[PDB]
Every structure is written in structure tokens, then in C-alpha cells.
Symmetry: C2
Subunit: 368 residues, 2 copies
């Protein structure tokens, strides 16, 4: 088989980066998110030939679109649903095949994150450009006007940015010195600012306890951050227990998930109404909404606190990404697994009903 480097799940689709700089995609294709030129669903992983030879180094999905970028090509590509300018091409057009974001050509890209209808990019210098829907200030540009092209977040002048993340309509960031910012839609307290108001510019979280943050990720209406100590924090919406605090209450400021204090967190991912966190010792913990089985624990009970996601022969997990109603994961033996809702083909195991525990994707896996 071929070695899987990067995985990303969208609301209803999944995307992978293989060695060879090869992109493949599967799931719902109705909005063009798969990049294949047609609008049909794919129930099994499908190579995105248009990107062969472009030296893609990364891929990330928003809700109904996909972004990818190349270091050597110094290029960023986007395809999928076009409304609100989320693709960054200066028009609203849908794209059924990848296109370069001209604004981003030749810029040193450190990371891209995609939300429902907006994206951001962080440069090596630690600058942030954003584009797409901005009705609730989620671009962080001081206004409520949508932007069809990338614009610089001037509020970060003099503040170097490590990482950013994007939920449905809010955005979060961590600075190089470990500060946490949030802006955009905040009605569920998901900005971490201790209230339920929007921000049109980045605003600092001043409620850590002194804890500096190394990473951040968003689900739909909740946020997750990790400290330099490997401690996990969550905030925002907890109707479905996706904050994982053993209960169902909203948190307006970052809240440490003690249940996981005995481990060091390497990776985090937020989905629609659930959450995933991967420890340094290769154990995967999921929580939240489990109607479609997306938590992966072999049942369909919601989980208000972290619960270990089991794999065959206890193989260690090296990566995870949450869609809206599914989850994806890579293991040390280079197998790729998926679980949850399967109606759009997003599991990538061909024809399938929903799966409440992890299932191997033979096309990407060594094993069967």
C-alpha cells in the first residue's frame, strides 16, 4: 500500500495525503469538495489527478470545501462550495477541480485552517491572512463584510502567530509566546472570553491560570486548546457533552479537562458535536455526540467525558480528524480507519451503513 501522511475530514467528506505528493478524496461530492470535476459521491478513496506533480505537502477540509498547499510550488489551491468567497479567488464561483489562490502565490505558508465558510492562513513570519464569510467578524478584520480574497489581520502586527483554528463561524489562535485569542461568533461562549458576545477583531483570553497554550482546534461551536505541559482545555458549547467535562453545561472561559491530566496530549480535533484527543502514547480518546457512532466506542450512547477509542491489536494512533458525523484516524502500522455516518461514502469502505466502531479502509491500509 501507499503511506498515508495527512488526513482531513469535512462535514461529509474525507481527504488524504499519501507519499508521492498524492491527494485522494471521498464522500459527498455534490459541492465540488472532492476535486474530481463531477459532483457525485465517492464511497471509496479516489485520487485527485489534477494535483499530481504539484508537490502538495498538506490538505485541510472545511465544511463543504477543501484546501491544499505546496512548499516548492509556493502555491495554495482551493476547491468546493464557493459562496461567501471561502475559496479565496475573488468571486463566489463553486470549483469542481482545484485552483490556485493567486493572492497566496509565493508566500511561505505555515498552516491553513478552514471553518464552515471561512479560512485563514498563517505565514512563516507568523502573519495571518483570512477570507470568506465575516458576518460575525470571524475574519478578524474589524467589520462584518465578507471577503472574496485573503486579507491581512492587522490586529496581529507585532504578534507572531503559531497556529489558528476555525469553527463554523468563530476563529481561535495561539501566539508563539503561548497567548490564546478568539474572535467571531461567540454566543455559546466558544471564544473563551467569559461572555457570549461576538468579536470583530482578535481578543485575548485572559483566564488560563498562567497556562501557556501550544495548540488549538475548533469544533462547530466549541474550542479546544493544549498547554505546553500537554494539559487539555475546552470551552464553548456543551449541549452534547463535546467539552467532555462529565456534564452538559456551557463554559465561557477555557476549562481544564482533568480527566486527561494523567496523559500528554499530542493532537486534538473538533467535529460538529464531538471531539477527539490523541495522547503521546498513541491512545485516542473521543467524546460527545454519538448518534451515528462517531465517537468510535462500539455503541450509540453519547459520551459526556473522554472514553478510549479501541483498535484491533491495540495498534497506536498517529493521527485523527473529525467530520460532522464521522471520524478518521491513522495508526502506526499505516492502517487508516473510519467510523460513524456512512451515507455519503465518507467512511471510504465502499457501500456501508453507519459504523459505531473503527473500520479499516483497505485501499489506504496495509491490513484488511
Amino acid at each position: 500500500p501507499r503511506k498515508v501522511l495527512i488526513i482531513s475530514a469535512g462535514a461529509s467528506h474525507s481527504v488524504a495525503l499519501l507519499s508521492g505528493d498524492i491527494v485522494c478524496s471521498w464522500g459527498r461530492g455534490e459541492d465540488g469538495q472532492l476535486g474530481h470535476g463531477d459532483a457525485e459521491d465517492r464511497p471509496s478513496p479516489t485520487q485527485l489527478s489534477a494535483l499530481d506533480g504539484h508537490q502538495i505537502v498538506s490538505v485541510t477540509c472545511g465544511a463543504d470545501h477543501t484546501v491544499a498547499y505546496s512548499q516548492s510550488g509556493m502555491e495554495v489551491y482551493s476547491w468546493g462550495w464557493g459562496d461567501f468567497g471561502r475559496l479565496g479567488h475573488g468571486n463566489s464561483s463553486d470549483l469542481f477541480t482545484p485552483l490556485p489562490i493567486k493572492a497566496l502565490h509565493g508566500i511561505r505558508i505555515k498552516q491553513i485552517a478552514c471553518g464552515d465558510s471561512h479560512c485563514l492562513a498563517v505565514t512563516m513570519e507568523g502573519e495571518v491572512q483570512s477570507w470568506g464569510r465575516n458576518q460575525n467578524g470571524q475574519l478578524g478584520l474589524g467589520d462584518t463584510e465578507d471577503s472574496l480574497v485573503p486579507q491581512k489581520i492587522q490586529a496581529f502586527e507585532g504578534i507572531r502567530i503559531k497556529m489558528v483554528a476555525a469553527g463554523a463561524e468563530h476563529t481561535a489562535a495561539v501566539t508563539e509566546d503561548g497567548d490564546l485569542y478568539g474572535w467571531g461568533w461567540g454566543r455559546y461562549g466558544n471564544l473563551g472570553l467569559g461572555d457570549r458576545t461576538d468579536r470583530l477583531v482578535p481578543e485575548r483570553v485572559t483566564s488560563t491560570g498562567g497556562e501557556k497554550m501550544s495548540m488549538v482546534a475548533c469544533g462547530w461551536r466549541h474550542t479546544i486548546s493544549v498547554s505546553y505541559s500537554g494539559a487539555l482545555y475546552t470551552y464553548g458549547w456543551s449541549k452534547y457533552g463535546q467539552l467532555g467535562h462529565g456534564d452538559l453545561e456551557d463554559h465561557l472561559i477555557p476549562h481544564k479537562l482533568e480527566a486527561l491530566s494523567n496523559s500528554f496530549i499530542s493532537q486534538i480535533s473538533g467535529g460538529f458535536r464531538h471531539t477527539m484527543a490523541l495522547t503521546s502514547d498513541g491512545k485516542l480518546y473521543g467524546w460527545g455526540w454519538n448518534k451515528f457512532g462517531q465517537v468510535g466506542v462500539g455503541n450509540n450512547l453519547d459520551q459526556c467525558s473522554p472514553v478510549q477509542v479501541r483498535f484491533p491489536d491495540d495498534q497506536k494512533v498517529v493521527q485523527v480528524s473529525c467530520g460532522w458525523r464521522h471520524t478518521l484516524a491513522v495508526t502506526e502500522r499505516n492502517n487508516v480507519f473510519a467510523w460513524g455516518r456512512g451515507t455519503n461514502g465518507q467512511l471510504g469502505i465502499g457501500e456501508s451503513v453507519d459504523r459505531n466502531f473503527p473500520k479499516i479502509i483497505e485501499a489506504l491500509s496495509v491490513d484488511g
Copy 2:
């Protein structure tokens, strides 16, 4: 025996809903968020009776993007189901419903019409007042602010003003009064409010251009709006990236703009979809225009249409009813036949498993003919 006849059809993002004689509600298409109301999450590619409403005396059904509402004149009850986020369901919580539940706030209220957009709804009472609930981030509820409402609330701006009907797009709303004034509010960035600018309104504001011409009806697509004047002239405004305003170009209009190509005809019904438009003439002729990628304009191809083209039906039967979804269209004829066209991946076409269809196809389960 005789089929039941469709009394009412409505189309949502990717599902279809009908009311049949006998007060029977059925639905088909996408089921993932519970919009079908059968208590499960699977798509139905064929019409399926919503058993839970059997015996409830439903007189009308209306779809939003991924939700559905119905009501009962005699029982004086309004029911809703599907995606619950932002309170679009009206139950005072944000929980999804895979099965119809009564909107307790509307119990005992005489209901004249329901309109559903993406994540908001509005109801007009027989007395011609208007209540609304759901997402309100752009003031689409007309309540004065931008905070979502989990329960219906009365639009206070309409006191002293009787409402005939209302309409709702993705995040905007329009209404016409019992004497023909036209209003708009909510998300206004593409001019779809018809007020001459690209700014939201948090309360109903009267359209003053086309003010001289009165309006009998209004309908909304995603980001565009359609109205019919008392002389039967068709006006459109808002987004026309896909030619959905139908003016033979792709320009936006920030105020009502008359569609000349149809000046000769008298328009009796209108419908707005995701990126397409439908208009039914007084003599039973159906015209469609706009985005046609999945064949939803219904004119036998997949090329976009910036001007109105007549949709053709077997025997040139007359059409009496039409509803636009995002990527499909439904219509009822004078002969009691029901046709669907466009995208059918989620089963929204109602014709069993099928490829997409770019001209009308009869729905056998709800039709006289075949």
C-alpha cells in the same frame, strides 16, 4: 382505486414533502437531519407516509432547508421537525427532531400561512399578524435585534398592518400586506431586501421603489426575491450570479426590477430555489430560469438560463402548483399529476432510484397518470 390528490407540495434543500387528500402527510428525499419526520435518519427515494401525523388533521406543510413544519386548522396545532439548531423548530430548545412535535407556543392560534427559510420560520395568523423564530443573526426575525429566538415571538412592527403572506430566503424575509405594500428584512448583502442598498435590516422596512405598483405576492430563493404586482407583472431582485433574476444577464438588483420577457403574461404563482426561479402563468404555463447544473430548470439540458424558458409537460397539461428546492423542482398539474426534476441523489425526486433528470418526470405514487 383513485390516487389521493396532492393538496400541497413543498421542497426543501434536498427533501420533498406533500399533503394528500385524507389529511395524509408524506415525505421523501434526504433524511439525515430528521427532516422527513419518520423517526429515522435514512433517505427515502419514494413517498413515505408520515404516520405520526395520521389523525392530526394537517391542512398544510412547508419546508425549510433541512426542516419541515405543518399545521392543523381544526386542531389548532403547529408541528415541526428536523434540524433544531438556532431554534428553527420553535420548541424553546435547540434539539433536533426526527419526529413531529407540537409547537406549544402556537397552540390555539389561528394560522393562515407558514414560511420557512434556512434556519428561521414565520407564521401569519388569520388576523394577519406575524410570529417568528430561529436564527436571527442578521435580524431576519424582524424583532429589532440579532439574538436567535428558540420560541415564536410577535413582530411588533406590523401592528396596524395586516399581512397577507410572508416569504423567507436563506437569511432574509419579505412580506406583502393585505393592500399590496412590500417589505423586506434580514441579511441584505446582495440587495435581496429590495431597499436600494446592501445593508441588513433588523425590522421590516417598506419597499418604496415599485411603491407605485402594488404587490399581491412575494417568494424568496436563497439570496433573491420575487414579487408579483396587481397587474400580474413579475419583479425580481437580489443576487443574479446565476441569472436567477431572469433579466437576460447576470447583474444584481438592489430594488424590484420588472422581468420584461414576461410582460405579456399574467403571473399567478412564483417560487424561489437555491439558485433558480419558477413562475406559473394564469393559463397554467410554467417558466423556469437560473442555475441548471443538475437540470433543475427543467428544459431538457444542463446549461444555465438567464432568461425565462417554458417548462414542458406531457399533453401540455396545465400546471397549478410549483415548489423549488436547492437542486430540484416539484410541480402539480390540473389533472392531479405530480412531476419532479433536477438532482435526485438523495431521492428527492420521489421516483425510486434514479439518475438526475433535466425535464419533468411523473411521480407514479402521487399521480393520476404514468
